[PDB]
With several copies, the nearest count.
Chain A
Amino acid sequence: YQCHVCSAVLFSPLDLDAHVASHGLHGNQRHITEFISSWQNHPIVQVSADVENRKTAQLLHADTPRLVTWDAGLCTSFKIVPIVPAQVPQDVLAYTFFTSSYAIQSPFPEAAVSRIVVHTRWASNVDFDRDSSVIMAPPTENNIHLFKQLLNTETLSVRGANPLMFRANVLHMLLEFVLDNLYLNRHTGFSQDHTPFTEGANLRSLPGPDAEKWYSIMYPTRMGTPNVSKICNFVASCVRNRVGRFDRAQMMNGAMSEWVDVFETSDALTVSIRGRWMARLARMNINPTEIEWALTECAQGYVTVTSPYAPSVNRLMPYRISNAERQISQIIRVMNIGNNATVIQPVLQDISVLLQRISPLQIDPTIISNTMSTVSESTTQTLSPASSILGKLRPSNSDFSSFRVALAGWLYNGVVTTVIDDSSYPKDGGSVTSLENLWDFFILALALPLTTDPCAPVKAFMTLANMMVGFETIPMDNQIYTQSRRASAFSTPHTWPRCFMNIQLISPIDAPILRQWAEIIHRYWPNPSQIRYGTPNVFGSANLFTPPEVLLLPIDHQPANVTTPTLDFTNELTNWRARVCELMKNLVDNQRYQPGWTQSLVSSMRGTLGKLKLIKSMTPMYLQQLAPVELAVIAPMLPFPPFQVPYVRLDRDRVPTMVGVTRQSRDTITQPALSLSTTNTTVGVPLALDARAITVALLSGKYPPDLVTNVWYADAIYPMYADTEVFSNLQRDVITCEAVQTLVTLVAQISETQYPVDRYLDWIPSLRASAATAATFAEWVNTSMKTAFDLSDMLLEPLLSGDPRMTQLAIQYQQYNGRTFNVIPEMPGSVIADCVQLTAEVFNHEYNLFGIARGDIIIGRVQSTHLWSPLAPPPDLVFDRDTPGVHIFGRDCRISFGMNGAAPMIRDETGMMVPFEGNWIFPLALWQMNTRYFNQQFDAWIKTGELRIRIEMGAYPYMLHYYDPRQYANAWNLTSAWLEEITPTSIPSVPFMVPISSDHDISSAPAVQYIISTEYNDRSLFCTNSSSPQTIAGPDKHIPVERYNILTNPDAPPTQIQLPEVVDLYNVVTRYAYETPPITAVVMGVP
């Protein structure tokens, strides 16, 4: 067995038939990436990190989110729960077909009262639940728990929410609502129908044991019109041909379609949310040809990737994103460090080990030992240069981590800056009259050019100057510092000697060797360069302060060939070594600087320097030709991409000295709150290396004696691209950018920031959130998004470190001359924030469905036999600020007792003192400031007196207590319980007292009510007396026809929805069925 497409070998036909699916060929999974080479039999595959056996399989360590999740049940989010059950006689009881009886099934609960609630995904059959559910009980229950989650940590009442945080809680609730419906509809099977009312329609069938139990719920016209009821009037008003499947695709997969549009029970809000999510995912679609191109281009021309595939249209694999999103990601990754070296250690070390594994270069100090094997000294001569340099180089030690870490640090110039260790410099400054200090200087000057320290040249020059004190003098620029200032201390551009940048101030008669060393530094110091990498056309690029396709390098690179002279002094590093050795010869020749050497050592020093110069190393060749190639080969595959800052040789005026991250917008002036990146003396986090190890690695190195670069790099590139996770990191960058925009919008929604948000929820009361409050709110938002997308890694963690009230991100550094480069990624739109603003839009009009009431309440006795439903009061019972004869009370409400029979009095807002009677207008704040003292003076007056108070609510949750309208009822118990339980930090649900409708005549008993709303909040009421011909006493309500537009309205297009004002039920849904194949490739060697 074998696949003639990818040329893989298979064992069983049930394996071949499941393998061809990854190429797209049908027949009659666990793998996430499938690669196969062509010069050998060794396929490589990856699996998730919960794969429970990596049996010859690799792993995805990336915390990849889950973007594609499917739903098979219907797509509504609004139940219709019966509140007061009922049973009525009926004429027609069932249907008959020659011998049979089919029971009538109604689409809606036949009860005396039915109203809408909000239970997200109550009929969903999901393969991976987001777990961000918003489950709401019926109004007769207590829904106060939905509004005391975020910042109600210590409220005394176990039930009761803080009124100052309703807006924050509602915003989090809407976020959960949107974030729990982010699914993608399935394409479950159908079934031809022949019911006498639905002729020849094709009805969807939910997956499960039995499916006919859902037809009555889904298709309201399925029920006929057998009885005289409100439901039967509704069904007789509906139209009939809008039922079942509506339209299906032309592409078919066997005998079933690819997608369909079907009429069924749903809501416009959820269908719109899922349509927007589907559009967002579809915009990220990618092509196997493009994956082929991107990998072939990342490989730098050593191997060629090929991924064949069959022609299909229903294939989804979202991986395309924007440079703006990837830059915002990289900015958050840079915030994460925060001067913590533990976070940056493993990156550099692991990259160093990877370089050591995939590099052809080998290092043995036996080259140095062999070349020094012949130099020896005569007895009775106790000073040996060869022995000294051997003992100081330590060729026996074989730890060269400094070399590879110095290489890996070139990619991370902006976060970490590598410097040569302090203990590598000569002791006490050193002296030119000392052989050990001479060799120390040699090692140091030969190792300096490989560090990203911005001021290496000044350190080299001043090392030699410090050694040269007493024999040569250079001019000083102030009276404080001297020529013997330690060379460690020159670590910032403001310390560069003014005689270093202008050579002409070093007189050749007074400091000849210092002038020579200066000229050598200025002329032959290595020149920076830059090389291309990655594939910006498919993957994009995360570069911030560089163009999106270049990779800065502190040295020069050339095209690679192994047939290079091992000693050409046109190479930067080899010429540097030759120049340093020549200068040390010039220092040692005349013995002008070593008075005290009785023995003549010119010949020995010159011999050892000639041997060190004409050495047989290939490390310079490597660093010039093959090191940049493999750096560019590794770069696009790293978890934390390269974050560089420009390399400048000696241009002091444009040396980077500070990297900072901004969090506020540009047209604002706030507290200057610098990020923690700006507190480093260097540009990044300092890192010390070993000059001895760097010099030994740079001075002894060779290739294998049978190297063939094509074979070598093909074999080194296959396993490490077979273990790539760029495609997971791209999706994670998507999610990070979305979360950033969402947090910005929501936090501006409550705090005070210049960012425009359109302010859709301003009537819900709340407070001006401070730094701590906004930070805890953002923590809730963060953890919610993590839970919804199944993430365990960081996300928005660095943004929560002090004042999360942000407006936008930006990163910038500043040159020595004061210029700054400010980079501000243009953050694109975010589907999550757009959907949250849409759901706030729908909430503003239909808030009752979530258990909220708008306006305020009016406490005061009302006794009568009327049945006017306190959630919809008549006009004469409500008064406002414009009503004549009303008193308004501010915070300054002081009570004074009446003496000797005079009534007590309270202070009006206008200073007047008034008795306890009439119409008052409280803010809720007064009663909440002191509920204790207030409901000892007012209770006896509100209960049996003439007082009538209007507490200014704003938003308030409510609870319903249905009573029998044919018996006595008195709501004083509920009213007094509410008033007593209110507290300075919480309020319980406002208890109302609603009568019960009836389809027949009833008696009338006196009812006494003490709380009534001030505007129509009875909007969640769906229908009353559903199974009777009409309602004769009580609040009347028929089926809301405007929520069934496409059924009851003849001239309504099938896709028309009046979304902002009313959420339609029975919409048009589109059902999909995609394939998500793995990433397959066929690496081919290059001749």
Chain B
Amino acid sequence: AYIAVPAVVDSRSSEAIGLLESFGVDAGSDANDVSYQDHDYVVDQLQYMLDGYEAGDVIDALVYRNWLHHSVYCLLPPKSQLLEYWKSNPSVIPDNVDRRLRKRLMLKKDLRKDDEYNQLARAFKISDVYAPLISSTTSPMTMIQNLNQGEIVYTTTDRVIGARVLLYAPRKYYASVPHSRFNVGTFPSIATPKCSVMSGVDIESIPNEFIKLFYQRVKSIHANILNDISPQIVSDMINHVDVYRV
């Protein structure tokens, strides 16, 4: 199961604060099955990705995510530093790469000016070697689709949303989770039949203003197909103290 709440859910602190007695849920017991999810980085990625793309595209893409399906990005350095990494420590080379390109990268020549290797690198593109490659111009709907189907996704950029970003090469070549049957977290989805949203909190009172924008946009387009459940229904289904937060 999956439940979405109007708040930044986290697996570290949201258990300490609870958030369920916060919204008014009577989860208090030896429950230990309402496992939270990490959406801090997802909110940060949403903020960073609204900077270049358009809000409608980004939100309507992020709504179709299956948060109970683990996955992850991992970005590749550009083609030049990529080839430099192919060469040094060459025993990581995928087999898709051209036979000629591998036979020329396996050589210990200085490669100062190899008249044919320059052509072989010019006609080389990243998209053919690594199959799921998102884009520099992905038009993000395929991003969420590829996160839904598969375990690892290959990007050439940083503007991505949905999962964490992992490094492919060492840092030189760049510039400067179990389930629990009651998973919860922000950012509602309609991926499965068991995704629910907790109603009972007005839209104009949401304080984060990015969760707020997401909820307004998703609820004005998917009103008739979302599963609303009140705090009482959630309670029946389940069954450094910060000051200045009341």
Q: Taking the complex as a whole, does A directly touch B, i.e. does some CB pair lie under 8 Å apart?
A: yes
Q: Measuring CB to CB, which residues of chain A are less than 8 angstroms from any residue of chain B?
A: 377, 379-380, 382, 384, 387, 390-392, 394-397, 423, 436
Contacts of A436 in B (CB 8 A): 128
Q: 6 other contacts beyond A387-B99, A391-B99, A397-B95, with CB at 8 A cut-off? A: A377-B100, A379-B119, A380-B119, A382-B123, A391-B97, A423-B131
Contact B99 A390 (CB under 8 A): yes
Contact A387 B98 (CB under 8 A): yes
The 7 A-B pairs with the shortest beta carbon distances in the complex, nearest first, are: A387-B99, A396-B95, A394-B95, A379-B116, A382-B123, A391-B96, A387-B98
Q: B38 CB to closest chain A CB, in angstroms? A: 28
Contacts of A395 in B (CB 8 A): 95
- Give me 22 A-to-B residue pairs in the complex whose CB atoms sit less than 8 angstroms apart, sorted by A's number: A377-B100, A379-B116, A379-B119, A380-B116, A380-B119, A382-B119, A384-B98, A384-B100, A387-B98, A387-B99, A390-B99, A391-B95, A391-B96, A391-B97, A391-B98, A391-B99, A392-B96, A394-B96, A395-B95, A396-B95, A397-B95, A423-B131
Contacts of A396 in B (CB 8 A): 95
Q: B113 CB to closest chain A CB, in angstroms? A: 15
The winner among B95, B116, B128 for most chain A CB atoms within 10 A is: B95
Contacts of B95 in A (CB 8 A): 391, 394-397
B interface, how many residues as a size bin? Answer: 10 to 19
Contact A387 B100 (CB under 8 A): yes
Contacts of B98 in A (CB 8 A): 384, 387, 391
In the complex formed, the residue of A with least CB distance to B128 is: A436
Q: B95 CB to closest chain A CB, in angstroms? A: 5
In the complex formed, the residue of A with least CB distance to B97 is: A391
In the complex formed, the residue of B with least CB distance to A382 is: B123
In the complex formed, the residue of A with least CB distance to B101 is: A387
In the complex formed, the residue of A with least CB distance to B98 is: A387
Q: B146 CB to closest chain A CB, in angstroms? A: 11
Contacts of A397 in B (CB 8 A): 95
The winner among A382, A396, A423 for most chain B CB atoms within 10 A is: A382
Against A, the Cβ 8 Å flags (1 = close, 0 = not) of B6-38 are: 000000000000000000000000000000000
Contacts of B97 in A (CB 8 A): 391
Against A, the Cβ 8 Å flags (1 = close, 0 = not) of B76-117 are: 000000000000000000011111100000000000000010
Q: A423 CB to closest chain B CB, in angstroms? A: 8
Contacts of A392 in B (CB 8 A): 96
**From residue 118 to 137 of chain B, which have CB atoms closer than 8 A to chain A?**
119-120, 123, 128, 131
The winner among A379, A391, A392 for most chain B CB atoms within 10 A is: A391
Q: B135 CB to closest chain A CB, in angstroms? A: 14
In the complex formed, the residue of B with least CB distance to A396 is: B95
Contacts of A390 in B (CB 8 A): 99
In the complex formed, the residue of B with least CB distance to A375 is: B99
Contacts of B123 in A (CB 8 A): 382
Contacts of A394 in B (CB 8 A): 95-96
Contacts of A384 in B (CB 8 A): 98-100
Contacts of B128 in A (CB 8 A): 436
Contacts of A423 in B (CB 8 A): 131
Q: B105 CB to closest chain A CB, in angstroms? A: 14
Q: B208 CB to closest chain A CB, in angstroms? A: 38
Contacts of A382 in B (CB 8 A): 119-120, 123
Contacts of B131 in A (CB 8 A): 423
In the complex formed, the residue of A with least CB distance to B123 is: A382
In the complex formed, the residue of A with least CB distance to B131 is: A423
Q: B149 CB to closest chain A CB, in angstroms? A: 9
In the complex formed, the residue of B with least CB distance to A393 is: B95
The winner among B95, B98, B99, B131 for most chain A CB atoms within 10 A is: B99
Contacts of B96 in A (CB 8 A): 391-392, 394
Q: A488 CB to closest chain B CB, in angstroms? A: 14
In the complex formed, the residue of B with least CB distance to A394 is: B95
Q: B75 CB to closest chain A CB, in angstroms? A: 22
Against A, the Cβ 8 Å flags (1 = close, 0 = not) of B180-217 are: 00000000000000000000000000000000000000
**From residue 12 to 66 of chain B, which have CB atoms closer than 8 A to chain A?**
none
Q: A422 CB to closest chain B CB, in angstroms? A: 10
Against A, the Cβ 8 Å flags (1 = close, 0 = not) of B139-150 are: 000000000000
Q: B131 CB to closest chain A CB, in angstroms? A: 8
Q: B129 CB to closest chain A CB, in angstroms? A: 9
Contacts of A377 in B (CB 8 A): 100
Q: A381 CB to closest chain B CB, in angstroms? A: 10
Contacts of B119 in A (CB 8 A): 379-380, 382
In the complex formed, the residue of B with least CB distance to A436 is: B128
Q: A376 CB to closest chain B CB, in angstroms? A: 9
In the complex formed, the residue of B with least CB distance to A390 is: B99
In the complex formed, the residue of A with least CB distance to B132 is: A423
Q: B198 CB to closest chain A CB, in angstroms? A: 30
Q: A608 CB to closest chain B CB, in angstroms? A: 13
Q: A696 CB to closest chain B CB, in angstroms? A: 12
Contacts of B99 in A (CB 8 A): 384, 387, 390-391
In the complex formed, the residue of B with least CB distance to A388 is: B98
Q: B27 CB to closest chain A CB, in angstroms? A: 27
Q: B168 CB to closest chain A CB, in angstroms? A: 20
Q: A428 CB to closest chain B CB, in angstroms? A: 13
In the complex formed, the residue of B with least CB distance to A392 is: B96
Q: A364 CB to closest chain B CB, in angstroms? A: 15
The winner among B100, B119, B128 for most chain A CB atoms within 10 A is: B100
Q: A389 CB to closest chain B CB, in angstroms? A: 10
Contacts of B100 in A (CB 8 A): 377, 384, 387
Q: A607 CB to closest chain B CB, in angstroms? A: 16
Q: B44 CB to closest chain A CB, in angstroms? A: 32
In the complex formed, the residue of B with least CB distance to A397 is: B95
Q: B96 CB to closest chain A CB, in angstroms? A: 5
In the complex formed, the residue of A with least CB distance to B96 is: A391
Q: A693 CB to closest chain B CB, in angstroms? A: 14
